[PDB]
Amino acid sequence: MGASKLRAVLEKLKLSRDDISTAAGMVKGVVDHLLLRLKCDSAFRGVGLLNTGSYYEHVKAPNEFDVMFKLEVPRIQLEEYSNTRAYYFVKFKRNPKENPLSQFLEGEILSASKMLSKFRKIIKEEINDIKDTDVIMKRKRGGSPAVTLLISEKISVDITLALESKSSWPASTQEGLRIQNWLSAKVRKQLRLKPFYLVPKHAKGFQEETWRLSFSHIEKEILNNHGKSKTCCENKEEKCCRKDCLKLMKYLLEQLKERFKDKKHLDKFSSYHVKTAFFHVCTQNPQDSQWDRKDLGLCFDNCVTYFLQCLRTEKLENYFIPEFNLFSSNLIDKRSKEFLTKQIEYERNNEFPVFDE
Ligand SMILES: O=c1nc[nH]c2c1ncn2[C@@H]1O[C@@H]2COP(=O)(O)O[C@H]3[C@@H](O)[C@H](n4cnc5c(=O)nc[nH]c54)O[C@@H]3COP(=O)(O)O[C@H]2[C@H]1O
Ligand SMILES: [Zn+2]
């Protein structure tokens, strides 16, 4: 596939400045309201907005947003569940002390379901009272930590609540973030000093009171500063195609998901898998020269091939948690991965007709 053929698709995916300004304004307009009204509680007092991009995550629809609500918790003690390296129980070291979130304490373990229930209920009751904009609160999805709302029957916003921990990263993430050859071990050192987050997600019956590790902020960090050279993409001679490869991959997965929307094979595949795979390829190809713009197509293929391999071998390690396989037999069944593999292979073999619209 030609580089200009791909960059043409990327060119057509570009949304104008107005489409960003108006939608962004309509989003922040409700985000500020919900944010300020959430402060009217002892629990969600120190709530805050976390920058997980503050824009859209999927290229095509640009009417879908994703915001993350951070809530700091002091000196928490985590307890890994069932040797699932990603999922944890939240306990407090100072149990004798009275906690603001004490109402949600399921004993010594902080219940995620209660917090999600109160949070979501507050959102529903506030979305009821707003009159300046037409907003409806979307139905609860299957085991989703998010709360979605629709503004003016066109804008989708997924609000995800998350606990913040300034303490050192868990031992499961120790051998993760292998960016030493890519962004230097210094940057890894300084990045691991940053806080980590926790989202209310249950692990497989289901253990409904567990939390998942989240490093979305770090993903944004390495994503916006992606080159081995510090002046990468700041000058003409240092333009690369990492972000373009990520856009192309995400768009391919999205379009494939939409083509077979009627089926249920690709419903479990999300942009996070694509992101993860892309990070793995970045680790594999750390040199900026390996990401020359004129090599876009080739680069894209590298992102495709590897991804296919992960589907073929049923192995896709979480970039921060190596021992956690996103493509395990438990999470996603072989049949679906075979389907996606066949589709992607077809696309590549026929010059990606899914891009042509
Ligand atoms: O950490 C977060 N930061 C911002 N929003 C988040 C986060 N976690 C959840 N959500 C919000 O809830 C939606 C559904 O979540 P679900 O737990 O059911 O499945 C996730 C999950 O399997 C995987 N995923 C996504 N983020 C991570 C990660 O940080 N660490 C490990 N896995 C991850 O993608 C799938 C869906 O991707 P989407 O983003 O489309 O839709 C999310 C999102 O809206
Ligand atoms: Zn670059």
Residue numbers in the entry: 160 to 219, 222 to 365, 369 to 521
Sentences from the paper on this structure:
To study the β‐pseudo‐active form we obtained structures of an N‐terminal truncation of cGAS starting at residue 161 (cGAS161)22 in complex with five cyclic dinucleotides (2′,2′‐cGAMP, 2′,3′‐cGAMP, 3′,3′‐cGAMP, 3′,3′‐cdIMP and 3′,3′‐cdUMP), and the linear 2′,5′‐GpAp dinucleotide. There is always an interaction between the catalytic acid Asp227 and the dinucleotide when the β‐pseudo‐active conformation occurs. In most cases Asp227 forms a hydrogen bond with the amino group of the guanine base with an approach between 2.5 and 3.3 Å. The exception to this is 3′,3′‐cdIMP which does not have an amino group on its base, but does interact with Asp227 through the 2′‐OH guanine ribose (3.2 Å). Additionally, we observe that in all our cyclic dinucleotides structures, this site had better defined electron density than the other nucleobase site, even for identical ring systems like 3′,3′‐cdIMP and 3′,3′‐cdUMP.
Activated STING causes the activation of TBK1, which phosphorylates IRF3 allowing it to translocate to the nucleus where it triggers interferon‐inducible gene activation and interferon production. We report here the structure of cGAS with dinucleotides and small molecule inhibitors, and kinetic studies of the cGAS mechanism.
